[PDB]
Amino acid sequence: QISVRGLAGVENVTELKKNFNRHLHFTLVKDRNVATPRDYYFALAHTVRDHLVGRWIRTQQHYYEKDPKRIYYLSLEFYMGRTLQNTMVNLALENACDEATYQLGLDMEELEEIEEDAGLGNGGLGRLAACFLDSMATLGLAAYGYGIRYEFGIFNQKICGGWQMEEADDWLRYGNPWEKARPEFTLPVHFYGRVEHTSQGAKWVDTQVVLAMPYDTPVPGYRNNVVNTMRLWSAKAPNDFNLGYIQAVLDRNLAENISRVLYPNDNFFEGKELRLKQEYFVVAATLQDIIRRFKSSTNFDAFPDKVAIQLNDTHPSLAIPELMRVLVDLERLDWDKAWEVTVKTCAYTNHTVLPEALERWPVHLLETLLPRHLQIIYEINQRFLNRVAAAFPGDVDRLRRMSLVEEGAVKRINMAHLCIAGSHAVNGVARIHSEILKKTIFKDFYELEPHKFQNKTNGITPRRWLVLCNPGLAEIIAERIGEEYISDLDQLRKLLSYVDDEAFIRDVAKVKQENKLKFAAYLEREYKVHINPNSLFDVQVKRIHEYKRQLLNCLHVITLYNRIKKEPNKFVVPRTVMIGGKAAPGYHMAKMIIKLITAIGDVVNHDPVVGDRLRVIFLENYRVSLAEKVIPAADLSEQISTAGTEASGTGNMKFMLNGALTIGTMDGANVEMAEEAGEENFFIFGMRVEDVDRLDQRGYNAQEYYDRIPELRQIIEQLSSGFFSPKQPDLFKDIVNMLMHHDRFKVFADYEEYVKCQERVSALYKNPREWTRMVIRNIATSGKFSSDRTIAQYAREIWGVEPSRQRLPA
Amino acid sequence: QISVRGLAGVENVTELKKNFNRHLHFTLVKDRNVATPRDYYFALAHTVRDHLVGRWIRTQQHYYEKDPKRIYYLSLEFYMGRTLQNTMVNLALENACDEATYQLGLDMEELEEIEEDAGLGNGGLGRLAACFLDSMATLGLAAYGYGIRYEFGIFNQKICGGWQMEEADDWLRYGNPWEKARPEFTLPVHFYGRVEHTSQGAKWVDTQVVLAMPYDTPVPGYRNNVVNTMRLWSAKAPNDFNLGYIQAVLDRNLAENISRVLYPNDNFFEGKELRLKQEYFVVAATLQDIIRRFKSSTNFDAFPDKVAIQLNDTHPSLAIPELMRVLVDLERLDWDKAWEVTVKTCAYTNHTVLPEALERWPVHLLETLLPRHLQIIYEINQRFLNRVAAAFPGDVDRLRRMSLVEEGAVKRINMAHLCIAGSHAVNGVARIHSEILKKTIFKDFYELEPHKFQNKTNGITPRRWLVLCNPGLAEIIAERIGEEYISDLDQLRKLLSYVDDEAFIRDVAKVKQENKLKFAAYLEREYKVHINPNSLFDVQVKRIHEYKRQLLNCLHVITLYNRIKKEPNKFVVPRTVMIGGKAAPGYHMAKMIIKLITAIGDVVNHDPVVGDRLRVIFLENYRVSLAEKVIPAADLSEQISTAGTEASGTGNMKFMLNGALTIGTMDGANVEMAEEAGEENFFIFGMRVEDVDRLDQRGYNAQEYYDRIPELRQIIEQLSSGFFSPKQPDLFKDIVNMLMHHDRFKVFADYEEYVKCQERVSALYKNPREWTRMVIRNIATSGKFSSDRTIAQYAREIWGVEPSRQRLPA
Numbered sequence A, B: 001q002i003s004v005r006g007l008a009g010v011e012n013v014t015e016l017k018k019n020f021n022r023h024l025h026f027t028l029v030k031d032r033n034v035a036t037p038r039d040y041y042f043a044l045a046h047t048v049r050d051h052l053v054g055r056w057i058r059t060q061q062h063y064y065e066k067d068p069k070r071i072y073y074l075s076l077e078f079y080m081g082r083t084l085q086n087t088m089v090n091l092a093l094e095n096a097c098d099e100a101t102y103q104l105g106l107d108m109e110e111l112e113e114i115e116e117d118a119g120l121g122n123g124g125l126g127r128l129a130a131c132f133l134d135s136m137a138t139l140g141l142a143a144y145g146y147g148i149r150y151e152f153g154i155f156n157q158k159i160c161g162g163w164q165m166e167e168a169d170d171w172l173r174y175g176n177p178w179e180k181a182r183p184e185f186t187l188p189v190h191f192y193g194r195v196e197h198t199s200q201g202a203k204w205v206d207t208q209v210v211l212a213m214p215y216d217t218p219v220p221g222y223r224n225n226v227v228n229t230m231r232l233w234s235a236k237a238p239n240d241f242n243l244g245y246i247q248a249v250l251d252r253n254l255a256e257n258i259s260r261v262l263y264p265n266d267n268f269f270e271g272k273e274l275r276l277k278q279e280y281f282v283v284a285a286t287l288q289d290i291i292r293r294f295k296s297s298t299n300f301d302a303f304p305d306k307v308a309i310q311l312n313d314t315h316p317s318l319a320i321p322e323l324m325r326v327l328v329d330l331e332r333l334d335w336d337k338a339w340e341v342t343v344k345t346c347a348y349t350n351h352t353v354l355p356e357a358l359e360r361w362p363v364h365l366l367e368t369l370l371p372r373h374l375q376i377i378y379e380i381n382q383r384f385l386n387r388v389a390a391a392f393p394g395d396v397d398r399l400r401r402m403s404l405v406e407e408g409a410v411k412r413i414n415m416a417h418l419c420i421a422g423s424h425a426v427n428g429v430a431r432i433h434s435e436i437l438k439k440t441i442f443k444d445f446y447e448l449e450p451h452k453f454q455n456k457t458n459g460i461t462p463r464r465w466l467v468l469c470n471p472g473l474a475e476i477i478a479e480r481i482g483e484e485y486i487s488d489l490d491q492l493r494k495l496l497s498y499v500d501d502e503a504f505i506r507d508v509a510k511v512k513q514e515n516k517l518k519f520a521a522y523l524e525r526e527y528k529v530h531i532n533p534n535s536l537f538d539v540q541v542k543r544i545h546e547y548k549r550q551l552l553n554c555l556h557v558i559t560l561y562n563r564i565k566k567e568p569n570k571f572v573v574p575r576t577v578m579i580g581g582k583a584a585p586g587y588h589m590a591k592m593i594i595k596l597i598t599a600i601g602d603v604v605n606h607d608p609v610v611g612d613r614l615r616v617i618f619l620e621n622y623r624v625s626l627a628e629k630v631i632p633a634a635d636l637s638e639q640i641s642t643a644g645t646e647a648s649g650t651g652n653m654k655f656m657l658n659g660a661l662t663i664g665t666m667d668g669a670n671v672e673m674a675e676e677a678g679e680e681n682f683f684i685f686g687m688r689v690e691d692v693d694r695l696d697q698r699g700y701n702a703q704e705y706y707d708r709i710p711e712l713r714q715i716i717e718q719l720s721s722g723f724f725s726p727k728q729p730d731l732f733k734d735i736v737n738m739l740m741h742h743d744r745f746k747v748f749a750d751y752e753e754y755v756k757c758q759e760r761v762s763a764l765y766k767n768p769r770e771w772t773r774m775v776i777r778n779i780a781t782s783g784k785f786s787s788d789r790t791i792a793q794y795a796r797e798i799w800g801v802e803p804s805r806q807r808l809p810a
């Protein structure tokens, strides 16, 4: 079919066919006469899995013999999505399998659609972890992902009457062929109890035990025969647990609840006990595993030469005092030596700046749950503050600002402070974010230890986010510059020499149009909704939060609507405006925003005077598999967070790679993206960070904008008076109230510039040749945003290991 | 090695070896350098499972094409034990696998010991269901076992300080290679709600839904290529269940608790709501499955020609009103037609006579949980009592005696009464039990409908209970009369012509001695306990209950002890007395009996004057896999229930088949066993049923026996005064009090005859040649007690289908 999908050699195809039939018969216990498409999917998945395992066993064997430094990536989230196609791509099996299935009378694309997303994350942070695992394997690093195997991942979103409803994501219902249970490597985790001081140091006693059972999933690198491991822990009760009889057995559920469900909140901290248990559970089990593997190569001086532990935000921050606990209490190292080892082993990545996102755990929770860890934390704090006092003598306010312990009605532990003190490296996730960290929020820490602070700008894997989801674009690129760019994305820069090539312009535009038709058809089939596929596809997909300003997009949409109603017989560039994303279940304002988006659509989409010129669509249940469909179909990428709020973004990079132009603020990685493509090839608008600060100094008054902008005033009057909610006229009064009086993200302040910038987008879209030339300039400069680049930087500058592009033997 | 284990042909051995290595590598994801014995067990189990599936698919295919009448065996318990060896035996693979494993450097016996018992039953009733499935497959019947897949089966028993402790039996921890999840065939079950009457009949509405997910296990027949199915339901919550968010997801456990744990009570009724839910759950899911299979061959007149439903006691009795509900409410048949179909479809097996074992559910429970079923039950009752009134006019007391509804403080439904009314056949499980049913407890029902009442004496499968557990005995038998007896156990009668053959006498005695050495070694290894293997092995293994009279055995043991202490230098036949069995967790007296047994052992086993002449051993954690070891090692089988209390017994039959002599009362199947072997070849003692009745008429006074028997008086004084409990002198006062004042099972009344009969056993054991000749006479007449015989009788006399010994093609 296409070149970038590998060879379909006669013998490979024959062997895949016979193994497919072997798994259908023996593994699934089905004959051909009763097998459903789901059975056929599983037969294929098992067939493809068999090609992994030889490489998996060999890879892990090689690491045991060579004993390289090991990288442990600790995260509460891994948003993996589907595995079947990714595995085929990485093993060069895609064309052989397509042919093998074709010859059995099956359509492989249809079978790929049956696979559940592994939805073990909320959004950007969890998906970054997934991209990183892919890049680590592709770069030959001896890396392990460690997390929790949630029984229920991110909820499935249904819209009922324009409102979000949540349904449990029962992703394991039909089984997971990709994982292997390893109950033989089960480990104990302790909770509660009390601390006893003896002659022989501290002892943690009278604890409740929960077992941690590992499940291993293979992580294949791109065509290098390397298969790394993601190890996810599941919670099990011990068999003497509570041991009338019947009730004791049913109460085992209380222990197993720890790994039941992913907390569905992106960028907001909720201090629940169950969440703290999850955090300790993953840390405690993972560290025992790390230490046993280190001992099976008494001396912990070499520990940091053999182990790096990367903390994906503060969620696994308890790794720091847990490592200290093990080294001091169990291994009997003195404090100072243990601390040296811990700091050199641990590194911390920060992913936010909103004060409500920082983890600050009440002391009373830690006191009850993890009394030994609280003691270690106080000791860490005391020694740390002795260092601050010696460096800045007399600076008493600095001491309370830098403390790990926050004073107040409730005493709290600031986990970010703990991470900085206990790590040899601290990094933000985009250059502007890393600067903000050292200038404002961790300024005091930066002055004490400037050498700790780094930047590692985020990236995305070009395997999933180009080759897999946009094979048409990958192919036309491969026709011109070959295949090496897939594991060296900087080679896309060669495409600048095709910017005036008429054939390439035609092909880039044709691929986009095919992707748009394919997506428009998908909308009709699965959701009974029609769209004009010649319209500009204006897409904002990401989790729903105020700082992302889905509401600013809504204001633009209503502006275009009002303009059309005012001058119906004037030409305007047709648009399909698509907004998608999940709201956290407890977040009232985010749920109201979803309702507003669907309410706008109810008016706009049924106005006969609008025609097919404007459509507003809420994309239901946005998730990794839906991103793989909509991103290649997009013309315009909306990246419109208030400057200083989006730490990086990664969706922005996915769109850039797939031939959409970007409208956005100078926020997060948008700054670096514009810098790479040239500002003239980007639709930049709005306040910069400095402009936001100036506004905050004199005070943001929304009323001033309302008074000066007639078009904005009209929209606020329509919202208030019930134009978009005739049966419930006051339905949106909280939104209006927030915008006029309590808007932290300054929606009105960027309105005017956003609308003007949107007119420039429309003007360019009228000239397809120039639109497409600007697209080529974006794709061609997207190379920096490969996660291979990000990971190579972590490896050299933080972990002290060298990446490799060498094949292991097959 | 031995003939009855099949051929080890060169090509079979080679293919097993290559498949073993394929499963180790691909299925388990292990190399040889890190594999443990457990891994090797799983590799073997998967290798053997592959040979099942072709036959399994073919068998189910054949039934779909031929459309024979289908037999559905409904039970809350299936006590399957281990599967690996049984599967090898039934497929003629045992020698090929032994050789294949031997050539890979592995001992297959060692790998067999790693397998968990599937302990989904309490004792005799659950194990009968398992034997029956084996016989049904061996006789070529299109039969399905339907039950519940409990997450936790019968508890593991630990003895701590002589007391029973219970531990959860986490039998699925490492996976079950024998089952196949079928989530595609998941079905809804309804609970709670209310009934609405319309023009179009009754509607059950506002119900809570629990999903029933089936797991299928293969059941191979003996060398006939037939593989039937056991389908076990597991409980799952629907995904909209309760749908703050987090709590709704955690509350899914409430629905899934239905299939969490087996109720661990043998022969005692506890009316718990969770138990009633389990009973309806299995019935509701099973009936939908039955009906869909019937529709996929509008007319229910043929239903009883295509379906038989056998009820294993009253536990699935709700099948009767559920079948009526479906036919009347959903299919819209008139009542009388639906009733005709139901009665002709259903049959009921009774397994007890103790009034406290009968299921009598409070009306308020049924009213809340299953309101439509309660309505149907009242309607059934009304119509049934109209028939009684017409047959016996004026007999007002008969009407209240036969009612399905019992009056009292709490109104109750008598489920046995429902079963009799709603079934075309009612059977007991041994001739004396079936007679008792028609003379006393169901006398009124027998007078109304004598044609319903039958006997089907229980049996045991000779595959598990001879070939598998006692290969040495199977072989010496096969040397003389061939192999056909394994599926036609009446052929053992040919062994009577060897009763005077010196070589056969020698070989029978040698096999027993080997089994005893093998068991004595097993005791030393796994439990650090030494036993004289030349002693008589006196074994009582069964669940602990007062009616089984483990206490009568205890009194004998203390009598022998006191006799030795009185005349130390006199010869007595050495004995190892072994008592084993689990007590129901809430049953105080049964737990006290276990403690008494261990306390006796603490005195007897450490008395230097006793020497190796007497040992008392409590066999911990008695279960199916332990029965397979101890039963072939036994010399004397203790079957000493009070006459009229053991409905049948099946342990008794296992011992008979394996070369133990029986000491017992004329109770249950013991009567038929003595009748088959001749009373002169059996150690019968004690009151018959008639003698018990005579005692009850004039009143049982235990004090009379105490006053007349000095030896008995001495034992009661030792118990009371703290001889067996020096640190707690009054520890056994409840046992003494019960024996003297409140003994329903008349332990003292059989004491004298039991002790005299035990002296006759000892006298015979002194003459090994005559002991062994009596053994040959027992084994030779054990043919009636094959479950193949039992099942053939069910098939012809109840189900109306003909058994077959024909092979399906391989």
Ligand SMILES: OC[C@H]1O[C@@H](c2nnc(-c3cccc4ccccc34)[nH]2)[C@H](O)[C@@H](O)[C@@H]1O
Residues within 6 Å of the ligand: A122, A124, A125, A126, A128, A265, A266, A267, A268, A269, A270, A351, A352, A357, A358, A429, A458, A646, A647, A648, A649, A650, A668
């Ligand atoms: O670096 C990858 C992404 O991490 C996101 C994030 N930042 N914090 C979280 C987050 C995820 C899950 C649970 C949380 C709980 C509390 C606070 C933040 C989070 N997610 C940032 O908002 C993005 O700008 C960034 O591109």
Ligand SMILES: OC[C@H]1O[C@@H](c2nnc(-c3cccc4ccccc34)[nH]2)[C@H](O)[C@@H](O)[C@@H]1O
Residues within 6 Å of the ligand: B122, B124, B125, B126, B128, B265, B266, B267, B268, B269, B270, B351, B352, B357, B358, B429, B458, B646, B647, B648, B649, B650, B668
């Ligand atoms: O026919 C097979 C066996 O069934 C046993 C039984 N009889 N009732 C139960 C029973 C099992 C499980 C749960 C129960 C709950 C209440 C009452 C009885 C039971 N088990 C009888 O006691 C045995 O004599 C008989 O050999």
Ligand SMILES: O=c1[nH]cnc2c1ncn2[C@@H]1O[C@H](COP(=O)(O)O)[C@@H](O)[C@H]1O
Residues within 6 Å of the ligand: A057, A060, A061, A064, A293, A296, B031, B033, B034
């Ligand atoms: O003692 C050993 N001998 C040989 N190989 C080992 C040993 N321990 C670990 N390994 C290798 O390391 C892998 C197990 O990885 P683990 O998760 O670090 O235990 C296996 O696939 C083995 O190849």
Ligand SMILES: O=c1[nH]cnc2c1ncn2[C@@H]1O[C@H](COP(=O)(O)O)[C@@H](O)[C@H]1O
Residues within 6 Å of the ligand: A031, A033, A034, B057, B060, B061, B064, B293, B296
């Ligand atoms: O529609 C059908 N066509 C062919 N075979 C069928 C069909 N339905 C059921 N079967 C057979 O019956 C078996 C399924 O059993 P079930 O549990 O009764 O559904 C399969 O193994 C098939 O061979």
Ligand SMILES: *Cc1c(COP(=O)(O)O)cnc(C)c1O
Residues within 6 Å of the ligand: A122, A123, A124, A127, A541, A542, A543, A622, A623, A624, A627, A648, A649, A650, A651, A652, A654
């Ligand atoms: C990339 C991705 C995100 C992150 O998008 P942002 O626009 O950076 O928030 C969230 N969810 C899914 C499913 C993704 O694929």
Ligand SMILES: *Cc1c(COP(=O)(O)O)cnc(C)c1O
Residues within 6 Å of the ligand: B122, B123, B124, B127, B541, B542, B543, B622, B623, B624, B627, B648, B649, B650, B651, B652, B654
């Ligand atoms: C056969 C068997 C029973 C039944 O024995 P009885 O002596 O008839 O009560 C109970 N438990 C197990 C494990 C068995 O194998």
